[PDB]
């Protein structure tokens, strides 16, 4: 159907765009658009990317009146996928930015990794509960989500601490790693995502 990628948030999103583009190749009738405002009608797959601090992430979302647009997609039973910082924005709050409310699309909060050597950077394994490919992905983050098991899609360890590298609540997905920077298994992940939104 129609895939949308929010393009306002911190960090360059062209990489995730290329990744999603090449991944939607093997299928068809797949439209990809960059989203800057609500001045677009619902997509079937909406990506919320980003690389930066929780606070700026939400600011670029509200400054462009995109918050309701995102909440609108969930209520309307559509697939919303948070990538990297976008995954964190899915929760209620974060230590990285006190007082700033998150999209609150998933019950839980965000806290800094316990490790002394931050930020967490490099490849690490992600073990999925189901659906997606176990394997190594590329992470670059300082914060992690803290949610209930019910919403844990995948896990990853860094310096003794295991955290949810992937989360799920209905048609809402979140990946703490960069799919577009995870080569083979990444494109495969993105494909599986498109694949899931194609059915239902």
Curated annotation (Swiss-Prot):
Note the SUPFAM superfamilies from the entry. Class I glutamine amidotransferase-like
Sequence ranges assigned to domain Glutamine amidotransferase type-1 in this UniProt record = 2-200
Q: Where is the active site?
A: 84 (nucleophile), 178, 180
Q: Name one Pfam family in it.
A: GATase
| Keyword Transmembrane among UniProt keywords | no
Q: Which organism is it from?
A: Thermotoga maritima (strain ATCC 43589 / DSM 3109 / JCM 10099 / NBRC 100826 / MSB8)
Q: What is catalysed by this protein?
A: 5-[(5-phospho-1-deoxy-D-ribulos-1-ylimino)methylamino]-1-(5-phospho-beta-D-ribosyl)imidazole-4-carboxamide + L-glutamine = D-erythro-1-(imidazol-4-yl)glycerol 3-phosphate + 5-amino-1-(5-phospho-beta-D-ribosyl)imidazole-4-carboxamide + L-glutamate + H(+); L-glutamine + H2O = L-glutamate + NH4(+)
What does the entry list under GO cellular component? cytoplasm
State the EC number(s).
4.3.2.10, 3.5.1.2
Location relative to the cell:
Cytoplasm
- Complex and partners: Heterodimer of HisH and HisF.
| MF terms (GO), sorted A to Z | glutaminase activity; imidazoleglycerol-phosphate synthase activity; lyase activity
Tell me which PANTHER family the record gives.
IMIDAZOLE GLYCEROL PHOSPHATE SYNTHASE SUBUNIT HISH
What pathway does this protein act in?
Amino-acid biosynthesis; L-histidine biosynthesis; L-histidine from 5-phospho-alpha-D-ribose 1-diphosphate: step 5/9
Entry's InterPro entries?
A: Class_I_gatase-like, GATASE, Imidazole-glycPsynth_HisH
Q: How is its activity regulated?
A: Activated by the binding of either IGP or PRFAR to the active site of HisF.
Major subcellular location class: cytoplasm
Q: Per the UniProt record, which residue ranges are transmembrane?
A: none
- What NCBIfam families has UniProt attached to this entry? IMP_synth_hisH
Q: Which UniProt keywords apply?
A: Amino-acid biosynthesis, Cytoplasm, Glutamine amidotransferase, Histidine biosynthesis, Hydrolase, Lyase
Which BP terms from GO are recorded?
L-histidine biosynthetic process
Amino-acid biosynthesis listed as a keyword: yes
What biological function has been recorded for the protein in this entry? IGPS catalyzes the conversion of PRFAR and glutamine to IGP, AICAR and glutamate. The HisH subunit catalyzes the hydrolysis of glutamine to glutamate and ammonia as part of the synthesis of IGP and AICAR. The resulting ammonia molecule is channeled to the active site of HisF.
Recorded protein name is: Imidazole glycerol phosphate synthase subunit HisH
């Amino acid at each position: 159907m129609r895939i949308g990628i929010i393009s306002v948030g911190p960090g360059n999103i062209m990489n995730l765009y290329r990744g999603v583009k090449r991944a939607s190749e093997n299928f068809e009738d797949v439209s990809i658009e960059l989203v800057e405002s609500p001045r677009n009608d619902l997509y079937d797959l909406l990506f919320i990317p980003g690389v930066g601090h929780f606070g700026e992430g939400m600011r670029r979302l509200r400054e462009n009146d995109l918050i309701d647009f995102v909440r609108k997609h969930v209520e309307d039973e559509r697939y919303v996928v948070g990538v990297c910082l976008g995954m964190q924005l899915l929760f209620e709050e974060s230590e990285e930015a006190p007082g700033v409310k998150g999209l609150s699309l998933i019950e839980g909060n965000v806290v800094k990794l316990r490790s002394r050597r931050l930020p967490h950077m490099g490849w690490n394994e992600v073990i999925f509960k189901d659906t997606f490919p176990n394997g190594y992905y590329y992470f670059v983050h300082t914060y992690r989500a803290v949610c209930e098991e019910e919403h844990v899609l995948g896990t990853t360890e860094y310096d003794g601490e295991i955290f949810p590298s992937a989360v799920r609540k209905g048609r809402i997905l979140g990946f703490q790693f960069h799919p577009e920077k995870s080569s083979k298994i990444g494109r495969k992940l993105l494909e599986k995502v498109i694949e899931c939104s194609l059915s239902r």
